[PDB]
Amino acid sequence: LDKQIQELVEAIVLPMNQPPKGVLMYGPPGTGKTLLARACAAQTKATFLKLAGPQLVQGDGAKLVRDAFALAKEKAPSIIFIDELDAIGTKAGDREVQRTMLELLNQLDGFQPNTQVKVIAATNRVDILDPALLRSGRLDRKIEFPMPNEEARARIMQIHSRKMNVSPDVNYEELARCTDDFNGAQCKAVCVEAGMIALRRGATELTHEDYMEGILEVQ
């Protein structure tokens, strides 16, 4: 899971620090692509402008496209991360979102000043994919996700548990071994669950046995 976070961090940082324009971040569920791209946003440090799938469906989706590209035109080089694009781009409202889609590709095709702020796209499945997305300005980086391991779960749980007051005795192998058949948000239930009883325990610093005590507590 390092060559694709390197490919993503390059895809969105080498133009930030012809540069790439579009990225299609897909893969099987259970990985945490939204918090993996948000963990990437924690390394870019730029403004993270969230946008969901059905936000275009409210002739308003084209107004949100021209709004995100007006903030892309004038606003500082932030990080616009859209998600769930296959659900709204189902190839009479869906045809209106196909007009919004063809306006999106027309603005990613006929506009030369598109070297400014980019847009990160994420989908949960690539069965519904527009064949007209083959362009440098359009979605180019198509990456598939491998199955995560306990080491990668210690990586994302360490990026998500690096700022809190954790005692410096964590082998990561007891907790990495105990976290079986889990996902990113469930490891967030593990670490947040370890942060739950931090008040009533009295010790303001998180300890070692509270991770496995959260695993055995809620899961």
């Binding site: 390059e10 080498l14 012809q18 540069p19 790439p20 189902t90 190839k91 009479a92 869906d94 045809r95 063809l102 069965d127 519904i128 064949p131 007209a132 083959l134 440098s136 180019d140």
Partner: protein, 209 residues
């Protein structure tokens, strides 16, 4: 007002219809075969009347149909209902003038011989396999607008390409040009052509189903 492009041995209809449809096309409107499976209540009849109604309200109109082999069974009840709307709206009493539609397929066995009737499908062109010489010439006439380094060698690109798609040949070769443009070099060496064409082309062999 109708035509068929069946290329069972080989491919190459995507570079043609995408070359002219990307050139002028007089319009732009694509109809994909995945908007008909209708997982919900099968009300796709009024979707055909509405979408084709707009396709006839607009005077310039060209419609493409890709991957019709799975939706061309000889679940199938609503398929044959929309095919009855295709009969009554291809050879019916309607305003069936200049507006044009194009069908594409893979196998000439489940091609709905009711739809294979003239009128519903006037013309048919049997595309052949992309030959190694044809791959070389198509790579030379498609190698024009793309930039390359002075060191060129088409023998490795054409040689390492065996049983590939022509549309995937152009999108994988230009995909390798966009792979080499990452480091914003005006000159494009063929090392990244071998690398990205080889790896991404093998990914199109994994996804060549």
């Amino acid at each position: 007002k109708g035509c068929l492009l069946y290329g069972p041995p080989g491919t190459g209809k995507t570079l043609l219809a995408r070359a002219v449809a990307s050139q002028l096309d007089c319009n732009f409107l694509k109809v994909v075969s995945s908007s008909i499976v209708d997982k919900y209540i099968g009300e796709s009849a009024r979707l055909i009347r509405e979408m084709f109604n707009y396709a006839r309200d607009h005077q310039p109109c060209i419609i493409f149909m890709d991957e019709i082999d799975a939706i061309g069974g000889r679940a199938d009840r609503e398929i044959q209902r929309t095919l009855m709307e295709l009969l009554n709206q291809m050879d019916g009493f309607d305003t069936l003038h200049r507006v044009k539609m194009i069908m594409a397929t893979n196998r000439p066995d489940t091609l709905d011989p009711a739809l294979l009737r003239p009128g519903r499908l006037d013309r048919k062109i049997h595309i052949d396999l992309p030959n190694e010489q044809a791959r070389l010439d198509i790579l030379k006439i498609h190698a024009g607008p793309i930039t390359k380094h002075g060191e060129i060698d088409y023998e490795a690109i054409v040689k390492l390409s065996d049983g590939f798609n022509g549309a995937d040949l152009r999108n994988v070769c230009t995909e390798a040009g966009m792979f080499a443009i990452r480091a914003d070099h005006d000159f494009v060496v063929q090392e990244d052509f071998m690398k990205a064409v080889r790896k991404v082309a093998d990914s199109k062999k994994l996804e060549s189903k």
